[PDB]
């Protein structure tokens, strides 16, 4: 609830002039390295490392470091970065967004501050959108860093949990956004601390930062795959519809508890499966399901504070009436859904880890970013991520002709018009690139060109390697490309022999996008480095962004403002109005990603807690914190079990409270002062501590350097398994289709926080039984 996003914050043009000066300072010492030997140069890396630790700052050696990388580059790649690029680096070094246009040299610029900030040995992460663009940048700029005496590392989805660590080991590491997200999450599902692949998140430099932080924001990162030896076993758990005498366990208190089972059930239930009463021989599975299925019949019921069907189960609110869409029953009460009544089964995928890129990337101590289009959502870059967008003067003045939208009346005429324009361009031999929004519209224009027999290339948004090769050749004479929205990103389109003289790459958008950012991106592909190029969008009156005008009629003027689909139309007015629709569409998207951020935030805080607690259960032998924790978890279960079977009218009739003790914690001799034995809550501390601590001491004596072993595979499991994976899944469920009546979107923020901390309070409690019961009742 701090400030409010999109309103206003600090400046430009004190920041730029400062940079300018720096660049010119860089050029000043340009001679100090130019005739230096190769060895003397490499030595600078060391010299910098020595200076930094002795007391100097990154900022203190900027001019120079940058000057060294510049000279290096010129010697390794052939390219001596321009002042505009030098400026870029500063923009990034300040943890800002460097906005430079397509064809400007971002990757080069990234080496500059990447180097500077990699000298600490803390590491640096150079982020791109996809595998290929990493591997490439890694392989090409790899050279320049290595030359200065630094380790480059490439992180891919293929690599072993070993090779990955070894890459995060490198001074500099390259990766796709996703892996960075994944590797983090996977690190927090680990059984031994080594397995983790990541180091502390120091610095991140996203290239194409808009796609990553603005567009790909609206998806969470999900991990899924379920292995509860599920569907099959749930039917089998439900085989116990009959003779629920010997195992029809005791009743309970508060929200829920059926755990206990008389010896006669267990044994014979177990012979119906084939082992003993399970101790922690991958047994947990059967005990938890049998409890669940046993509960689904007696404990949790039908038609009052439990379930109502449709074809499946929907939690209700017995007093309000309405169906709580999106509410999963904790730790696998699918049992109700599936077999108790109607085979409405439910088990496929399972969410095991979730994160937003806005939370993930905010974990880093420093974020910097690069892209051609990022002045638009600037109020967000500085309000969500604390980065100012710097707009960087191009190296060479743009001589492109971004033409005013042409407006046809219907799809067909607009499409036909697109064909014609490509038709004319091929015949001239001028290369054409056609931006599309949808694979299906991508296909239609191709057919249009297949009837006209105009050789071309479609570009589907997938298999990036091929399309990169395609894209270089889209700047050659007679080239014809049609690029699915987000196709060929990251690659320059270099114009061919004498293509300059035909006007350069001509670009044709088949429609304006959900965001002017995307709109300008398209135009971007054309005017790089001061080559000519023309860009033009086509719009039909016949769709979205154009509804403003559905119901428009006239008194004395040309009705519809572009009639009969003969020719096109132009007016600033209509184009102006398209902007509204665009900007309004941009609004929705902001809101939907704000809400996501707001949803993950609940998870974020929830998850940092559990992550921290898990790892602590892993570093558990010298303080005997696995027993100290196991002791707390036990004392909870009691204090909770004790204080309901004793309300404020009366602490009375101890009989089920007796059962509880015996078939939850301790053997038959779970009776003492049978009932009405005085009457206290804190009498329960002594008497249950007695029968449990004495037993724990004796349980840990017969087989005791192992019980530590025993707790660990008990605690960590039940924590990991029922709690986290079931919460994570159940959460993503509520996030999803919390679309029951009487909620408004992102107000559910209110319901979500509420129902999701409720859930957590419980899941923590479920953990607390699981561990107490098992330590006490699982024997060889
Ligand atoms: N200073 C330079 N000298 C020579 N060539 C350059 C220079 N800067 C960039 N280039 C070339 O122009 C292309 C554009 O640079 P790039 O790093 O891709 O930036 P952008 O992503 O803005 O296009 C690259 O393929 C590179 O080979």
Can you walk through the features of this model?
This protein is an alpha/beta fold. The chain has 4 domains: 1-227 and 350-396, P-loop containing nucleotide triphosphate hydrolases (Rossmann fold, 3-Layer(aba) Sandwich); 228-349, SecA, preprotein cross-linking domain (Pre-protein croslinking domain of SecA); 397-598, P-loop containing nucleotide triphosphate hydrolases (Rossmann fold), CATH 3.40.50.300; 599-780, Orthogonal Bundle (Helical scaffold and wing domains of SecA). It is built from 25 helices and 16 strands. A 7-stranded parallel beta sheet has the order 3-4-2-5-8-1-9, sandwiched between helices. Strands 10, 11, 12, 13, 14, 15 and 16 form a 7-stranded parallel beta sheet that branches. It has a two-stranded antiparallel ribbon with strand order 6-7. Helix 18 links the parallel strand 13 (457-459) and strand 14 (480-484). Adenosine-5'-diphosphate binds at residues 79, 81-82, 100, 102-108, 492. The PDB classes it as protein transport. Keywords: protein translocation, signal peptide binding, protein transport. The assembly is monomeric.
Summarize the structure.
Its cofactor is Zn(2+). By secondary structure, this protein is α/β, with parallel strands linked by helices.
Q: Could you please say which CATH topology of the largest domain applies here?
A: Rossmann fold
SS elements, strand count: 16
List the total number of helices.
25
Strand content: 5-15%
In terms of quaternary structure, the protein is monomer
**CATH class value of the largest domain:** Alpha Beta
Total separate domains: 4
User: Which structural category do the helix and sheet elements fall into?
Assistant: alpha/beta
Distance between the termini: 54 Å
Largest sheet: 7 strands, parallel
Helical fraction equals: 40-55%
Per CATH, the superfamily of the largest domain is P-loop containing nucleotide triphosphate hydrolases
Bound molecules: adenosine-5'-diphosphate
Task: Order the strands across the largest sheet as they lie in space.
Answer: 3-4-2-5-8-1-9
CATH architecture of the largest domain: 3-Layer(aba) Sandwich
User: How does the overall form come out from the CA principal axes?
Assistant: globular
Radius of gyration: 33 Å
């Amino acid at each position: 609830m701090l400030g409010i996003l999109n309103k206003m914050f600090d400046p430009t043009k004190r920041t730029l002039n400062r940079y300018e000066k720096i660049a010119n300072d860089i050029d000043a010492i340009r001679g100090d390295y130019e005739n230096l030997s190769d060895d003397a140069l490499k030595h600078k890396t060391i010299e910098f490392k020595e200076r930094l630790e002795k007391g100097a700052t990154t900022d203190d050696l900027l001019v120079e470091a940058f000057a060294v990388v510049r000279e290096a580059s010129r010697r390794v790649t052939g390219m001596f970065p321009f002042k505009v690029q030098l400026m870029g680096g500063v923009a990034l070094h300040d943890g800002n967004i460097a906005e430079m246009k397509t064809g400007e040299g971002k990757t080069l610029t990234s080496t500059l501050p990447v180097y500077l900030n990699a000298l600490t040995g803390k590491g640096v992460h150079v982020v791109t959108v996809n595998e290929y663009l990493a591997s490439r940048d890694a392989e090409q700029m790899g050279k320049i860093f290595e030359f200065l005496g630094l380790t480059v590392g490439l992180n891919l989805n293929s690599m072993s949990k070993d090779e990955k660590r070894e890459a995060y080991a490198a001074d500099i590491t390259y990766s796709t956004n996703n892996e960075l997200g994944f590797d983090y999450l996977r690190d927090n599902m680990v059984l031994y601390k080594e397995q983790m692949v990541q180091r502390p998140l120091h610095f991140a430099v996203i290239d194409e930062v808009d796609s990553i932080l603005i567009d790909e924001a609206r998806t969470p990162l999900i991990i899924s795959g379920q292995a509860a030896k599920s569907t099959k076993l749930y039917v089998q758990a439900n085989a116990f519809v009959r003779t629920l005498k010997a195992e029809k366990d005791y009743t309970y208190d508060i929200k829920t508890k059926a755990v206990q089972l008389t010896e006669e059930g267990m044994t014979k239930a177990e012979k119906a499966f084939g082992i003993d009463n399970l101790f922690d021989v991958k047994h947990v599975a059967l005990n938890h399901h049998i409890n669940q299925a046993l509960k689904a019949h007696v404990a949790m019921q039908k038609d009052v504070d439990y379930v109502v069907e449709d074809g499946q189960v929907v939690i209700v609110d017995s007093f309000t009436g309405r169906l709580m869409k999106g509410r999963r029953y904790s730790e696998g009460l699918h049992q109700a859904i599936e077999a108790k009544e109607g085979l409405e089964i439910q088990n496929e995928s399972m969410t095991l880890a979730t994160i937003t890129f806005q939370n993930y990337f905010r974990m880093y101590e420093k974020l910097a970013g690069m892209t051609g289009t990022a002045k638009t959502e600037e109020e967000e870059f500085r309000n969500i991520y604390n980065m100012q967008v710097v707009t960087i003067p191009t190296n060479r003045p743009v001589v492109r002709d971004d033409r005013p939208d042409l407006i046809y009346r219907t799809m067909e005429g607009k499409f036909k018009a697109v064909a014609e324009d490509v038709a004319q361009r091929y015949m001239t031999g001028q290369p054409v690139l056609v931006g599309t929004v949808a694979v299906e519209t991508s296909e239609l224009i191709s057919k249009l060109l297949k009837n006209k027999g105009i050789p071309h290339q479609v570009l589907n948004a997938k298999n990036h390697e091929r399309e990169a090769q395609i894209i270089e050749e889209a700047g050659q004479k007679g080239a014809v490309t049609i690029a699915t929205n987000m196709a060929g990103r990251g690659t320059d389109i270099k114009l061919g022999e004498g293509v300059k003289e035909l006007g350069g790459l001509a670009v044709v958008g088949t429609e304006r996008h959900e965001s002017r950012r995307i709109d300008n991106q398209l135009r971007g592909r054309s005017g790089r480095q001061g080559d000519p190029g023309i860009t033009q969008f086509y719009l039909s009156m016949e769709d979205e962004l154009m509804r403003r005008f559905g119901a428009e009629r006239t008194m004395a003027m040309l009705d519809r403002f572009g009639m009969d689909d003969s020719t096109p139309i132009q007016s600033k007015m209509v184009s102006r109005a398209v902007e509204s629709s665009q900007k309004r569409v941009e609004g929705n998207n902001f809101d939907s990603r704000k809400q996501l951020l707001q949803y993950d935030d609940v998870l974020r805080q929830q998850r940092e807690v559990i992550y921290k607690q898990r790892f602590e259960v892993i570093d558990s032998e010298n303080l005997r914190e696995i027993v100290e924790n196991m002791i707390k978890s036990s004392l909870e279960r009691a204090i909770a079990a004790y204080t309901p079977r004793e309300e404020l009218p009366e602490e009375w009739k101890l009989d089920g409270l007796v059962d509880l003790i015996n078939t939850t914690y301790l053997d038959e001799g779970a009776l003492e002062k049978s009932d009405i034995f005085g009457k206290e809550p804190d009498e329960m501390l002594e008497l249950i501590m007695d029968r449990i601590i004495t037993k724990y001491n004796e349980k840990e004596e017969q087989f005791g350097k192992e019980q530590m072993r025993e707790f660990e595979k008990v605690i960590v499991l039940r924590a990991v398994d029922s709690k986290w994976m079931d919460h994570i899944d159940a959460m993503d469920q509520l996030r999803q289709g919390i679309h029951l009546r009487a909620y408004a979107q992102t107000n559910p923020l209110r319901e979500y926080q509420m129902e999701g901390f409720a859930m957590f309070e419980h899941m923590i409690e479920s953990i607390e039984d699981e561990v107490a019961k098992f330590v006490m009742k699982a024997e060889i």
